[PDB]
Scaffold this active site. Sequence first.
Site, PDB file in Angstrom:
ATOM      1  N   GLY A   1       0.751  -1.227   0.000  1.00  0.00           N
ATOM      2  CA  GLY A   1       0.000   0.000   0.000  1.00  0.00           C
ATOM      3  C   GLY A   1       0.789   1.290   0.000  1.00  0.00           C
ATOM      4  N   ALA A   2       2.103   1.275   0.153  1.00  0.00           N
ATOM      5  CA  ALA A   2       2.888   2.510   0.131  1.00  0.00           C
ATOM      6  C   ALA A   2       3.375   2.887  -1.250  1.00  0.00           C
ATOM      7  CB  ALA A   2       4.108   2.409   1.052  1.00  0.00           C
TER       8      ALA A   2
ATOM      9  N   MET B   1       6.394   4.475  -3.627  1.00  0.00           N
ATOM     10  CA  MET B   1       7.828   4.595  -3.668  1.00  0.00           C
ATOM     11  C   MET B   1       8.299   5.573  -4.731  1.00  0.00           C
ATOM     12  SD  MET B   1      10.524   1.503  -4.006  1.00  0.00           S
ATOM     13  CE  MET B   1      12.286   1.522  -3.789  1.00  0.00           C
ATOM     14  N   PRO B   2       9.082   6.590  -4.409  1.00  0.00           N
ATOM     15  CA  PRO B   2       9.534   7.481  -5.472  1.00  0.00           C
ATOM     16  C   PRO B   2      10.429   6.737  -6.454  1.00  0.00           C
ATOM     17  CG  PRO B   2       9.788   8.535  -3.342  1.00  0.00           C
ATOM     18  CD  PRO B   2       9.519   7.073  -3.100  1.00  0.00           C
ATOM     19  N   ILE B   3      10.159   6.989  -7.738  1.00  0.00           N
ATOM     20  CA  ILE B   3      10.818   6.243  -8.794  1.00  0.00           C
ATOM     21  C   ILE B   3      12.238   6.742  -9.045  1.00  0.00           C
ATOM     22  CG2 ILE B   3       8.704   5.628  -9.932  1.00  0.00           C
ATOM     23  CD1 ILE B   3       9.412   7.872 -12.077  1.00  0.00           C
TER      24      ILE B   3
ATOM     25  N   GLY C   1      15.631   7.907  -6.927  1.00  0.00           N
ATOM     26  CA  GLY C   1      16.246   8.102  -5.614  1.00  0.00           C
ATOM     27  C   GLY C   1      17.729   8.339  -5.745  1.00  0.00           C
ATOM     28  N   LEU C   2      18.364   8.675  -4.640  1.00  0.00           N
ATOM     29  CA  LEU C   2      19.778   8.945  -4.558  1.00  0.00           C
ATOM     30  C   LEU C   2      20.557   7.740  -4.046  1.00  0.00           C
ATOM     31  CD1 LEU C   2      21.987  11.309  -4.751  1.00  0.00           C
ATOM     32  CD2 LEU C   2      21.724  11.504  -2.297  1.00  0.00           C
TER      33      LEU C   2
ATOM     34  N   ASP D   1      18.807   5.616  -1.209  1.00  0.00           N
ATOM     35  CA  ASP D   1      19.208   4.215  -1.152  1.00  0.00           C
ATOM     36  C   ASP D   1      20.480   4.081  -0.339  1.00  0.00           C
ATOM     37  OD1 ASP D   1      18.873   1.365  -2.274  1.00  0.00           O
ATOM     38  OD2 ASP D   1      20.993   1.860  -2.626  1.00  0.00           O
TER      39      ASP D   1
ATOM     40  N   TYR E   1      27.973   0.326   3.146  1.00  0.00           N
ATOM     41  CA  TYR E   1      28.539   1.506   2.489  1.00  0.00           C
ATOM     42  C   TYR E   1      29.265   2.394   3.495  1.00  0.00           C
ATOM     43  CZ  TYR E   1      25.183   0.297  -1.260  1.00  0.00           C
ATOM     44  OH  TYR E   1      24.455  -0.356  -2.242  1.00  0.00           O
TER      45      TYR E   1
ATOM     46  N   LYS F   1      19.746  -2.119   3.491  1.00  0.00           N
ATOM     47  CA  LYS F   1      20.022  -3.483   3.062  1.00  0.00           C
ATOM     48  C   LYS F   1      20.804  -4.224   4.150  1.00  0.00           C
ATOM     49  CE  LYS F   1      20.593  -1.497  -1.510  1.00  0.00           C
ATOM     50  NZ  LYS F   1      21.489  -0.377  -1.179  1.00  0.00           N
TER      51      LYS F   1
ATOM     52  N   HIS G   1      20.573  -7.789   0.788  1.00  0.00           N
ATOM     53  CA  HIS G   1      21.448  -7.098  -0.130  1.00  0.00           C
ATOM     54  C   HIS G   1      21.932  -8.022  -1.248  1.00  0.00           C
ATOM     55  CE1 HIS G   1      24.460  -3.566  -0.051  1.00  0.00           C
ATOM     56  NE2 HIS G   1      24.209  -3.935  -1.311  1.00  0.00           N
TER      57      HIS G   1
HETATM   58  N1  LIG Z   1      21.974  -3.552  -4.422  1.00  0.00           N
HETATM   59  C1  LIG Z   1      23.273  -3.644  -4.693  1.00  0.00           C
HETATM   60  O1  LIG Z   1      23.910  -4.706  -4.794  1.00  0.00           O
HETATM   61  C2  LIG Z   1      23.894  -2.389  -5.366  1.00  0.00           C
HETATM   62  C3  LIG Z   1      25.110  -2.443  -6.132  1.00  0.00           C
HETATM   63  C4  LIG Z   1      25.638  -1.267  -6.742  1.00  0.00           C
HETATM   64  C5  LIG Z   1      24.939  -0.050  -6.576  1.00  0.00           C
HETATM   65  N2  LIG Z   1      23.727  -0.064  -5.776  1.00  0.00           N
HETATM   66  C6  LIG Z   1      23.073   1.269  -5.438  1.00  0.00           C
HETATM   67  O2  LIG Z   1      22.869   1.928  -6.698  1.00  0.00           O
HETATM   68  C7  LIG Z   1      23.466   3.270  -6.670  1.00  0.00           C
HETATM   69  C8  LIG Z   1      23.879   3.721  -8.060  1.00  0.00           C
HETATM   70  O3  LIG Z   1      24.895   2.802  -8.587  1.00  0.00           O
HETATM   71  P1  LIG Z   1      26.464   3.152  -8.523  1.00  0.00           P
HETATM   72  O4  LIG Z   1      26.836   3.996  -7.348  1.00  0.00           O
HETATM   73  O5  LIG Z   1      27.130   1.852  -8.699  1.00  0.00           O
HETATM   74  O6  LIG Z   1      26.806   4.011  -9.845  1.00  0.00           O
HETATM   75  P2  LIG Z   1      26.038   5.000 -10.873  1.00  0.00           P
HETATM   76  O7  LIG Z   1      24.933   5.705 -10.175  1.00  0.00           O
HETATM   77  O8  LIG Z   1      25.805   4.244 -12.088  1.00  0.00           O
HETATM   78  O9  LIG Z   1      27.238   6.017 -11.211  1.00  0.00           O
HETATM   79  C9  LIG Z   1      27.733   6.845 -10.175  1.00  0.00           C
HETATM   80  C10 LIG Z   1      28.999   7.509 -10.796  1.00  0.00           C
HETATM   81  O10 LIG Z   1      28.532   8.399 -11.778  1.00  0.00           O
HETATM   82  C11 LIG Z   1      28.959   9.717 -11.527  1.00  0.00           C
HETATM   83  N3  LIG Z   1      27.905  10.631 -11.886  1.00  0.00           N
HETATM   84  C12 LIG Z   1      26.685  10.907 -11.314  1.00  0.00           C
HETATM   85  N4  LIG Z   1      25.944  11.774 -11.964  1.00  0.00           N
HETATM   86  C13 LIG Z   1      26.729  12.098 -13.053  1.00  0.00           C
HETATM   87  C14 LIG Z   1      26.419  13.004 -14.092  1.00  0.00           C
HETATM   88  N5  LIG Z   1      25.281  13.706 -14.192  1.00  0.00           N
HETATM   89  N6  LIG Z   1      27.419  13.138 -15.064  1.00  0.00           N
HETATM   90  C15 LIG Z   1      28.613  12.418 -15.004  1.00  0.00           C
HETATM   91  N7  LIG Z   1      28.892  11.547 -13.970  1.00  0.00           N
HETATM   92  C16 LIG Z   1      27.919  11.402 -12.995  1.00  0.00           C
HETATM   93  C17 LIG Z   1      29.182   9.776 -10.029  1.00  0.00           C
HETATM   94  O11 LIG Z   1      30.189  10.778  -9.763  1.00  0.00           O
HETATM   95  P3  LIG Z   1      30.234  11.705  -8.441  1.00  0.00           P
HETATM   96  O12 LIG Z   1      29.466  10.991  -7.363  1.00  0.00           O
HETATM   97  O13 LIG Z   1      31.738  11.942  -8.184  1.00  0.00           O
HETATM   98  O14 LIG Z   1      29.540  13.030  -8.877  1.00  0.00           O
HETATM   99  C18 LIG Z   1      29.765   8.391  -9.753  1.00  0.00           C
HETATM  100  O15 LIG Z   1      31.148   8.287 -10.161  1.00  0.00           O
HETATM  101  C19 LIG Z   1      24.591   3.069  -5.618  1.00  0.00           C
HETATM  102  O16 LIG Z   1      25.190   4.223  -5.101  1.00  0.00           O
HETATM  103  C20 LIG Z   1      23.861   2.169  -4.548  1.00  0.00           C
HETATM  104  O17 LIG Z   1      22.982   3.036  -3.802  1.00  0.00           O
HETATM  105  C21 LIG Z   1      23.186  -1.197  -5.173  1.00  0.00           C
HETATM  106  O1  LIG Z   2      26.939  -4.338  -2.644  1.00  0.00           O
HETATM  107  C1  LIG Z   2      26.843  -3.198  -3.038  1.00  0.00           C
HETATM  108  O2  LIG Z   2      25.702  -2.524  -3.008  1.00  0.00           O
HETATM  109  C2  LIG Z   2      27.985  -2.395  -3.607  1.00  0.00           C
HETATM  110  N1  LIG Z   2      29.209  -3.196  -3.753  1.00  0.00           N
HETATM  111  C3  LIG Z   2      30.166  -2.992  -2.880  1.00  0.00           C
HETATM  112  C4  LIG Z   2      31.271  -3.757  -2.860  1.00  0.00           C
HETATM  113  C5  LIG Z   2      31.394  -4.818  -3.838  1.00  0.00           C
HETATM  114  O3  LIG Z   2      32.375  -5.583  -3.900  1.00  0.00           O
HETATM  115  N2  LIG Z   2      30.363  -4.966  -4.703  1.00  0.00           N
HETATM  116  C6  LIG Z   2      30.422  -6.061  -5.665  1.00  0.00           C
HETATM  117  C7  LIG Z   2      29.778  -7.289  -5.101  1.00  0.00           C
HETATM  118  N3  LIG Z   2      29.438  -8.318  -5.781  1.00  0.00           N
HETATM  119  C8  LIG Z   2      28.893  -9.333  -5.072  1.00  0.00           C
HETATM  120  C9  LIG Z   2      28.464 -10.577  -5.523  1.00  0.00           C
HETATM  121  C10 LIG Z   2      27.924 -11.393  -4.524  1.00  0.00           C
HETATM  122 CL1  LIG Z   2      27.323 -12.969  -5.036  1.00  0.00          CL
HETATM  123  C11 LIG Z   2      27.848 -11.095  -3.171  1.00  0.00           C
HETATM  124  C12 LIG Z   2      28.316  -9.850  -2.727  1.00  0.00           C
HETATM  125  C13 LIG Z   2      28.825  -9.024  -3.723  1.00  0.00           C
HETATM  126  S1  LIG Z   2      29.445  -7.430  -3.363  1.00  0.00           S
HETATM  127  C14 LIG Z   2      29.289  -4.146  -4.645  1.00  0.00           C
HETATM  128  O4  LIG Z   2      28.393  -4.331  -5.461  1.00  0.00           O
END
Ligand SMILES: NC(=O)c1ccc[n+]([C@@H]2O[C@H](COP(=O)([O-])OP(=O)(O)OC[C@H]3O[C@@H](n4cnc5c(N)ncnc54)[C@H](OP(=O)(O)O)[C@@H]3O)[C@@H](O)[C@H]2O)c1
Ligand SMILES: O=C(O)Cn1ccc(=O)n(Cc2nc3cc(Cl)ccc3s2)c1=O
Length: 315
Positions: A9-10, A12-14, A16-17, A43, A48, A77, A110
Amino acid sequence: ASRILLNNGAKMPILGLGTWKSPPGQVTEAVKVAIDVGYRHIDCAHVYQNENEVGVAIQEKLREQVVKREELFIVSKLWCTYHEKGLVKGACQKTLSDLKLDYLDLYLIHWPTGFKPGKEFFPLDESGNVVPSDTNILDTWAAMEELVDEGLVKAIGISNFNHLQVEMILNKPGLKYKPAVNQIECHPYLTQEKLIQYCQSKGIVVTAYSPLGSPDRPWAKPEDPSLLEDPRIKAIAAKHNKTTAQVLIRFPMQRNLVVIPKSVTPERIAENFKVFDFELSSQDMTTLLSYNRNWRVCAPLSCTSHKDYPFHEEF
Ligand SMILES: NC(=O)c1ccc[n+]([C@@H]2O[C@H](COP(=O)([O-])OP(=O)(O)OC[C@H]3O[C@@H](n4cnc5c(N)ncnc54)[C@H](OP(=O)(O)O)[C@@H]3O)[C@@H](O)[C@H]2O)c1
Ligand SMILES: O=C(O)Cn1ccc(=O)n(Cc2nc3cc(Cl)ccc3s2)c1=O
Protein backbone atom coordinates in the site's frame (compact mmCIF):
# COMPACT_ATOMS: atom_id res chain seq x y z
CA ALA A 1 3.94 9.78 -12.18
CA SER A 2 6.68 10.29 -9.57
CA ARG A 3 5.84 7.34 -7.31
CA ILE A 4 5.06 3.67 -7.83
CA LEU A 5 2.69 1.56 -5.72
CA LEU A 6 4.17 -1.25 -3.66
CA ASN A 7 2.45 -4.46 -2.48
CA ASN A 8 2.11 -3.00 1.03
CA GLY A 9 0.00 0.00 0.00
CA ALA A 10 2.89 2.51 0.13
CA LYS A 11 4.18 4.62 -2.72
CA MET A 12 7.83 4.59 -3.67
CA PRO A 13 9.53 7.48 -5.47
CA ILE A 14 10.82 6.24 -8.79
CA LEU A 15 13.96 8.42 -8.59
CA GLY A 16 16.25 8.10 -5.61
CA LEU A 17 19.78 8.94 -4.56
CA GLY A 18 22.41 6.23 -4.43
CA THR A 19 25.10 6.41 -1.72
CA TRP A 20 27.54 3.57 -2.46
CA LYS A 21 31.08 5.09 -2.53
CA SER A 22 29.82 8.48 -1.27
CA PRO A 23 32.51 9.25 1.23
CA PRO A 24 31.52 10.06 4.77
CA GLY A 25 33.34 13.33 4.32
CA GLN A 26 30.93 14.38 1.47
CA VAL A 27 27.66 12.42 1.69
CA THR A 28 26.05 14.64 4.34
CA GLU A 29 26.23 17.58 1.94
CA ALA A 30 25.04 15.41 -0.98
CA VAL A 31 21.96 14.32 0.87
CA LYS A 32 21.12 17.83 2.08
CA VAL A 33 21.29 19.16 -1.47
CA ALA A 34 19.42 16.19 -2.83
CA ILE A 35 16.51 16.83 -0.45
CA ASP A 36 16.62 20.51 -1.25
CA VAL A 37 16.19 19.95 -4.97
CA GLY A 38 13.46 17.29 -4.66
CA TYR A 39 14.76 13.82 -3.89
CA ARG A 40 12.68 11.92 -1.38
CA HIS A 41 14.14 8.43 -1.76
CA ILE A 42 17.61 7.62 -0.51
CA ASP A 43 19.21 4.21 -1.15
CA CYS A 44 21.53 3.19 1.68
CA ALA A 45 23.33 0.17 3.08
CA HIS A 46 25.32 -0.72 6.22
CA VAL A 47 28.15 -1.97 4.01
CA TYR A 48 28.54 1.51 2.49
CA GLN A 49 29.92 2.62 5.81
CA ASN A 50 28.28 6.08 5.67
CA GLU A 51 24.81 5.63 7.10
CA ASN A 52 25.67 7.84 10.06
CA GLU A 53 26.49 10.71 7.75
CA VAL A 54 23.34 10.10 5.71
CA GLY A 55 21.45 10.20 8.99
CA VAL A 56 23.06 13.53 9.92
CA ALA A 57 21.63 15.09 6.75
CA ILE A 58 18.15 13.69 7.15
CA GLN A 59 17.99 14.77 10.74
CA GLU A 60 18.98 18.23 9.90
CA LYS A 61 16.56 18.74 7.08
CA LEU A 62 13.80 17.37 9.36
CA ARG A 63 14.92 19.89 11.98
CA GLU A 64 14.88 22.71 9.41
CA GLN A 65 11.28 21.87 8.42
CA VAL A 66 12.29 21.20 4.81
CA VAL A 67 10.69 17.79 4.78
CA LYS A 68 8.63 15.54 7.05
CA ARG A 69 9.63 11.93 7.81
CA GLU A 70 6.48 10.61 6.12
CA GLU A 71 7.47 12.20 2.79
CA LEU A 72 10.83 10.41 2.89
CA PHE A 73 11.42 6.94 1.50
CA ILE A 74 14.55 5.46 3.10
CA VAL A 75 15.93 2.12 1.96
CA SER A 76 18.69 0.06 3.48
CA LYS A 77 20.02 -3.48 3.06
CA LEU A 78 21.01 -6.40 5.29
CA TRP A 79 24.67 -7.19 4.58
CA CYS A 80 25.80 -10.76 3.78
CA THR A 81 27.52 -11.39 7.12
CA TYR A 82 24.21 -11.00 8.96
CA HIS A 83 22.08 -13.62 7.23
CA GLU A 84 21.72 -15.81 10.31
CA LYS A 85 18.25 -15.35 11.81
CA GLY A 86 19.79 -14.40 15.19
CA LEU A 87 21.67 -11.46 13.61
CA VAL A 88 19.05 -9.92 11.39
CA LYS A 89 17.26 -7.67 13.88
CA GLY A 90 20.50 -6.38 15.34
CA ALA A 91 21.73 -5.47 11.87
CA CYS A 92 18.49 -3.64 11.15
CA GLN A 93 18.63 -1.84 14.46
CA LYS A 94 22.25 -0.76 13.85
CA THR A 95 21.17 0.75 10.54
CA LEU A 96 18.22 2.55 12.18
CA SER A 97 20.45 3.91 14.95
CA ASP A 98 23.01 5.13 12.46
CA LEU A 99 20.38 6.76 10.27
CA LYS A 100 18.66 8.18 13.38
CA LEU A 101 15.33 6.76 12.26
CA ASP A 102 12.65 4.71 13.95
CA TYR A 103 11.61 2.81 10.83
CA LEU A 104 12.80 2.10 7.30
CA ASP A 105 10.41 2.31 4.36
CA LEU A 106 12.13 -0.65 2.73
CA TYR A 107 14.74 -3.14 3.87
CA LEU A 108 16.39 -5.50 1.40
CA ILE A 109 18.42 -8.68 1.55
CA HIS A 110 21.45 -7.10 -0.13
CA TRP A 111 22.70 -10.26 -1.81
CA PRO A 112 21.34 -13.85 -1.72
CA THR A 113 24.68 -15.11 -0.46
CA GLY A 114 25.42 -15.33 3.22
CA PHE A 115 29.02 -14.83 4.29
CA LYS A 116 30.80 -16.01 7.44
CA PRO A 117 29.64 -13.90 10.31
CA GLY A 118 32.26 -11.57 11.80
CA LYS A 119 33.65 -8.07 11.63
CA GLU A 120 35.02 -8.28 8.08
CA PHE A 121 32.46 -7.53 5.42
CA PHE A 122 34.26 -9.64 2.84
CA PRO A 123 35.84 -12.59 4.63
CA LEU A 124 38.17 -14.47 2.37
CA ASP A 125 40.30 -17.54 3.09
CA GLU A 126 44.08 -17.67 2.66
CA SER A 127 43.43 -18.28 -1.05
CA GLY A 128 41.04 -15.37 -1.54
CA ASN A 129 37.75 -17.23 -1.81
CA VAL A 130 34.82 -15.69 -0.02
CA VAL A 131 33.96 -17.73 3.08
CA PRO A 132 30.26 -18.52 3.05
CA SER A 133 27.87 -18.99 5.94
CA ASP A 134 25.53 -21.87 6.48
CA THR A 135 22.43 -19.83 5.96
CA ASN A 136 19.71 -20.15 3.29
CA ILE A 137 17.43 -17.58 1.69
CA LEU A 138 14.19 -18.88 3.13
CA ASP A 139 15.28 -18.63 6.80
CA THR A 140 16.78 -15.22 6.13
CA TRP A 141 13.50 -14.12 4.56
CA ALA A 142 11.55 -15.30 7.60
CA ALA A 143 13.82 -13.21 9.78
CA MET A 144 13.11 -10.23 7.49
CA GLU A 145 9.39 -10.79 7.87
CA GLU A 146 9.67 -10.46 11.64
CA LEU A 147 11.00 -6.95 11.19
CA VAL A 148 7.82 -5.97 9.41
CA ASP A 149 5.73 -7.52 12.17
CA GLU A 150 7.67 -5.60 14.78
CA GLY A 151 7.34 -2.26 13.00
CA LEU A 152 11.02 -1.64 12.29
CA VAL A 153 10.46 -1.69 8.54
CA LYS A 154 7.34 -1.03 6.39
CA ALA A 155 8.28 -3.32 3.50
CA ILE A 156 10.91 -5.93 2.72
CA GLY A 157 12.47 -7.07 -0.47
CA ILE A 158 15.52 -8.51 -2.17
CA SER A 159 18.46 -7.48 -4.25
CA ASN A 160 20.56 -9.37 -6.81
CA PHE A 161 18.19 -12.41 -6.71
CA ASN A 162 17.77 -14.39 -9.93
CA HIS A 163 14.23 -15.49 -10.88
CA LEU A 164 14.61 -18.93 -9.32
CA GLN A 165 15.73 -17.33 -6.03
CA VAL A 166 12.71 -15.04 -6.22
CA GLU A 167 10.41 -18.05 -6.86
CA MET A 168 11.82 -19.87 -3.80
CA ILE A 169 10.48 -17.09 -1.67
CA LEU A 170 7.18 -16.73 -3.51
CA ASN A 171 6.59 -20.46 -3.13
CA LYS A 172 7.67 -20.52 0.53
CA PRO A 173 5.30 -22.57 2.68
CA GLY A 174 3.89 -20.21 5.27
CA LEU A 175 5.10 -17.04 3.48
CA LYS A 176 3.98 -13.94 5.41
CA TYR A 177 5.08 -11.12 3.17
CA LYS A 178 5.93 -11.25 -0.53
CA PRO A 179 8.97 -9.21 -1.55
CA ALA A 180 8.00 -5.73 -2.57
CA VAL A 181 11.12 -4.92 -4.64
CA ASN A 182 14.01 -6.68 -6.33
CA GLN A 183 16.89 -4.24 -6.76
CA ILE A 184 19.20 -5.29 -9.60
CA GLU A 185 21.86 -3.90 -11.89
CA CYS A 186 20.30 -2.45 -15.00
CA HIS A 187 21.41 -0.15 -17.82
CA PRO A 188 21.74 -0.26 -21.63
CA TYR A 189 24.58 -2.82 -21.57
CA LEU A 190 22.63 -5.07 -19.11
CA THR A 191 18.97 -4.59 -19.88
CA GLN A 192 17.53 -7.48 -17.87
CA GLU A 193 14.52 -8.03 -20.09
CA LYS A 194 13.66 -11.55 -18.77
CA LEU A 195 14.15 -10.83 -15.08
CA ILE A 196 12.19 -7.59 -15.33
CA GLN A 197 9.36 -9.41 -17.12
CA TYR A 198 9.40 -12.09 -14.44
CA CYS A 199 9.38 -9.69 -11.55
CA GLN A 200 6.80 -7.33 -12.96
CA SER A 201 4.54 -10.29 -13.80
CA LYS A 202 4.70 -11.25 -10.14
CA GLY A 203 3.91 -7.73 -8.89
CA ILE A 204 7.44 -7.07 -7.68
CA VAL A 205 8.77 -3.62 -8.39
CA VAL A 206 12.24 -3.54 -9.92
CA THR A 207 14.81 -0.93 -8.87
CA ALA A 208 17.76 -0.42 -11.28
CA TYR A 209 21.19 0.16 -9.77
CA SER A 210 24.38 1.46 -11.42
CA PRO A 211 22.22 3.12 -14.10
CA LEU A 212 25.18 5.21 -15.23
CA GLY A 213 27.41 2.13 -15.32
CA SER A 214 29.23 2.95 -12.06
CA PRO A 215 32.39 4.49 -13.51
CA ASP A 216 33.65 4.92 -9.91
CA ARG A 217 33.45 1.19 -9.16
CA PRO A 218 36.75 0.16 -7.63
CA TRP A 219 37.54 -2.71 -10.06
CA ALA A 220 37.04 -0.69 -13.23
CA LYS A 221 39.44 -1.55 -16.01
CA PRO A 222 40.41 1.13 -18.53
CA GLU A 223 39.17 -1.04 -21.40
CA ASP A 224 35.74 -1.67 -19.91
CA PRO A 225 32.61 -0.29 -21.56
CA SER A 226 31.75 3.24 -20.44
CA LEU A 227 28.04 4.21 -20.70
CA LEU A 228 28.55 7.85 -19.91
CA GLU A 229 31.10 8.17 -22.72
CA ASP A 230 29.23 6.12 -25.29
CA PRO A 231 28.96 8.27 -28.46
CA ARG A 232 25.65 6.64 -29.48
CA ILE A 233 24.00 7.67 -26.24
CA LYS A 234 25.65 11.09 -26.40
CA ALA A 235 23.81 11.53 -29.72
CA ILE A 236 20.43 10.57 -28.25
CA ALA A 237 20.97 13.13 -25.48
CA ALA A 238 22.08 15.89 -27.84
CA LYS A 239 18.82 15.44 -29.79
CA HIS A 240 16.82 16.07 -26.60
CA ASN A 241 19.15 18.79 -25.36
CA LYS A 242 19.83 16.71 -22.22
CA THR A 243 22.99 15.14 -20.82
CA THR A 244 23.92 11.46 -21.29
CA ALA A 245 23.25 10.90 -17.60
CA GLN A 246 19.69 12.33 -17.85
CA VAL A 247 19.11 9.96 -20.80
CA LEU A 248 20.42 7.05 -18.73
CA ILE A 249 18.17 7.95 -15.77
CA ARG A 250 15.07 8.54 -17.89
CA PHE A 251 15.44 5.19 -19.71
CA PRO A 252 14.57 2.92 -16.76
CA MET A 253 11.76 5.29 -15.67
CA GLN A 254 10.05 4.59 -18.96
CA ARG A 255 10.28 0.82 -18.25
CA ASN A 256 8.21 1.26 -15.04
CA LEU A 257 11.39 0.84 -13.03
CA VAL A 258 12.73 2.76 -10.05
CA VAL A 259 16.27 4.16 -10.56
CA ILE A 260 18.88 5.28 -8.07
CA PRO A 261 21.75 7.24 -9.63
CA LYS A 262 24.62 8.14 -7.28
CA SER A 263 26.40 11.45 -6.94
CA VAL A 264 28.13 13.54 -4.29
CA THR A 265 28.62 16.51 -6.72
CA PRO A 266 25.89 19.16 -6.06
CA GLU A 267 25.52 20.18 -9.69
CA ARG A 268 25.16 16.57 -10.80
CA ILE A 269 22.68 15.80 -8.02
CA ALA A 270 20.51 18.61 -9.44
CA GLU A 271 21.10 17.60 -13.10
CA ASN A 272 20.11 14.01 -12.38
CA PHE A 273 16.70 14.98 -10.95
CA LYS A 274 15.80 17.07 -14.03
CA VAL A 275 14.36 14.14 -15.92
CA PHE A 276 10.64 14.81 -15.61
CA ASP A 277 10.54 17.41 -18.39
CA PHE A 278 11.16 15.17 -21.41
CA GLU A 279 10.36 11.84 -22.99
CA LEU A 280 12.52 9.33 -24.83
CA SER A 281 10.79 8.24 -28.03
CA SER A 282 9.90 4.70 -28.91
CA GLN A 283 12.93 4.57 -31.23
CA ASP A 284 15.23 5.92 -28.48
CA MET A 285 13.94 3.20 -26.18
CA THR A 286 14.43 0.54 -28.84
CA THR A 287 17.94 1.78 -29.62
CA LEU A 288 19.02 1.86 -26.01
CA LEU A 289 17.66 -1.64 -25.35
CA SER A 290 19.62 -2.83 -28.39
CA TYR A 291 22.89 -2.02 -26.63
CA ASN A 292 22.56 -4.94 -24.27
CA ARG A 293 25.71 -6.98 -23.90
CA ASN A 294 24.76 -8.85 -20.72
CA TRP A 295 27.59 -6.92 -19.08
CA ARG A 296 27.85 -6.61 -15.29
CA VAL A 297 29.47 -3.99 -13.07
CA CYS A 298 28.79 -6.30 -10.13
CA ALA A 299 29.82 -9.94 -10.68
CA PRO A 300 33.06 -10.73 -8.80
CA LEU A 301 34.79 -14.07 -9.44
CA SER A 302 35.52 -14.46 -5.72
CA CYS A 303 31.81 -15.27 -5.07
CA THR A 304 31.12 -17.45 -8.09
CA SER A 305 31.48 -20.70 -6.16
CA HIS A 306 28.90 -19.67 -3.54
CA LYS A 307 25.99 -22.13 -3.60
CA ASP A 308 23.58 -19.18 -3.84
CA TYR A 309 25.70 -17.15 -6.36
CA PRO A 310 22.97 -15.56 -8.49
CA PHE A 311 24.42 -15.09 -11.95
CA HIS A 312 25.13 -18.60 -13.15
CA GLU A 313 21.42 -18.73 -14.14
CA GLU A 314 20.27 -17.07 -17.34
CA PHE A 315 18.03 -14.80 -15.31
N1 LIG B 1 21.97 -3.55 -4.42
C1 LIG B 1 23.27 -3.64 -4.69
O1 LIG B 1 23.91 -4.71 -4.79
C2 LIG B 1 23.89 -2.39 -5.37
C3 LIG B 1 25.11 -2.44 -6.13
C4 LIG B 1 25.64 -1.27 -6.74
C5 LIG B 1 24.94 -0.05 -6.58
N2 LIG B 1 23.73 -0.06 -5.78
C6 LIG B 1 23.07 1.27 -5.44
O2 LIG B 1 22.87 1.93 -6.70
C7 LIG B 1 23.47 3.27 -6.67
C8 LIG B 1 23.88 3.72 -8.06
O3 LIG B 1 24.89 2.80 -8.59
P1 LIG B 1 26.46 3.15 -8.52
O4 LIG B 1 26.84 4.00 -7.35
O5 LIG B 1 27.13 1.85 -8.70
O6 LIG B 1 26.81 4.01 -9.84
P2 LIG B 1 26.04 5.00 -10.87
O7 LIG B 1 24.93 5.71 -10.18
O8 LIG B 1 25.81 4.24 -12.09
O9 LIG B 1 27.24 6.02 -11.21
C9 LIG B 1 27.73 6.84 -10.18
C10 LIG B 1 29.00 7.51 -10.80
O10 LIG B 1 28.53 8.40 -11.78
C11 LIG B 1 28.96 9.72 -11.53
N3 LIG B 1 27.91 10.63 -11.89
C12 LIG B 1 26.69 10.91 -11.31
N4 LIG B 1 25.94 11.77 -11.96
C13 LIG B 1 26.73 12.10 -13.05
C14 LIG B 1 26.42 13.00 -14.09
N5 LIG B 1 25.28 13.71 -14.19
N6 LIG B 1 27.42 13.14 -15.06
C15 LIG B 1 28.61 12.42 -15.00
N7 LIG B 1 28.89 11.55 -13.97
C16 LIG B 1 27.92 11.40 -13.00
C17 LIG B 1 29.18 9.78 -10.03
O11 LIG B 1 30.19 10.78 -9.76
P3 LIG B 1 30.23 11.71 -8.44
O12 LIG B 1 29.47 10.99 -7.36
O13 LIG B 1 31.74 11.94 -8.18
O14 LIG B 1 29.54 13.03 -8.88
C18 LIG B 1 29.77 8.39 -9.75
O15 LIG B 1 31.15 8.29 -10.16
C19 LIG B 1 24.59 3.07 -5.62
O16 LIG B 1 25.19 4.22 -5.10
C20 LIG B 1 23.86 2.17 -4.55
O17 LIG B 1 22.98 3.04 -3.80
C21 LIG B 1 23.19 -1.20 -5.17
O1 LIG C 1 26.94 -4.34 -2.64
C1 LIG C 1 26.84 -3.20 -3.04
O2 LIG C 1 25.70 -2.52 -3.01
C2 LIG C 1 27.98 -2.39 -3.61
N1 LIG C 1 29.21 -3.20 -3.75
C3 LIG C 1 30.17 -2.99 -2.88
C4 LIG C 1 31.27 -3.76 -2.86
C5 LIG C 1 31.39 -4.82 -3.84
O3 LIG C 1 32.37 -5.58 -3.90
N2 LIG C 1 30.36 -4.97 -4.70
C6 LIG C 1 30.42 -6.06 -5.67
C7 LIG C 1 29.78 -7.29 -5.10
N3 LIG C 1 29.44 -8.32 -5.78
C8 LIG C 1 28.89 -9.33 -5.07
C9 LIG C 1 28.46 -10.58 -5.52
C10 LIG C 1 27.92 -11.39 -4.52
CL1 LIG C 1 27.32 -12.97 -5.04
C11 LIG C 1 27.85 -11.09 -3.17
C12 LIG C 1 28.32 -9.85 -2.73
C13 LIG C 1 28.82 -9.02 -3.72
S1 LIG C 1 29.44 -7.43 -3.36
C14 LIG C 1 29.29 -4.15 -4.65
O4 LIG C 1 28.39 -4.33 -5.46
